[PDB]
Amino acid sequence: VVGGXX
Amino acid sequence: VVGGXX
Amino acid sequence: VVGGXX
Amino acid sequence: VVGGXX
Ligand SMILES: OC(C(F)(F)F)C(F)(F)F
Ligand SMILES: OC(C(F)(F)F)C(F)(F)F
Ligand SMILES: OC(C(F)(F)F)C(F)(F)F
Numbered sequence: 001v002v003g004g005x006x
Numbered sequence: 007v008v009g010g011x012x
Numbered sequence: 013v014v015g016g017x018x
Numbered sequence: 019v020v021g022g023x024x
């Protein structure tokens with residue numbers, strides 16, 4: 001899986 | 007501001 | 013600002 | 019198998 005942000 | 011995770 | 017995975 | 023992003 002991959003994820004992120006802000 | 008404050009944030010993060012993963 | 014964050015990101016991750018694999 | 020491949021994955022990525024951000
Ligand atoms: O979630 C992984 C990714 F990101 F697609 F490569 C997996 F390989 F496990 F599918
Ligand atoms: O965003 C800051 C926080 F996180 F609320 F402390 C500020 F105080 F500057 F609003
Ligand atoms: O992305 C960060 C967060 F999470 F919003 F605090 C930044 F401080 F950089 F805005």
Ligand SMILES: OC(C(F)(F)F)C(F)(F)F
Nearest residue numbers: 001002018019020021022
């Ligand atoms: O996921 C691989 C791919 F990319 F299809 F070749 C596997 F060899 F494992 F199928």
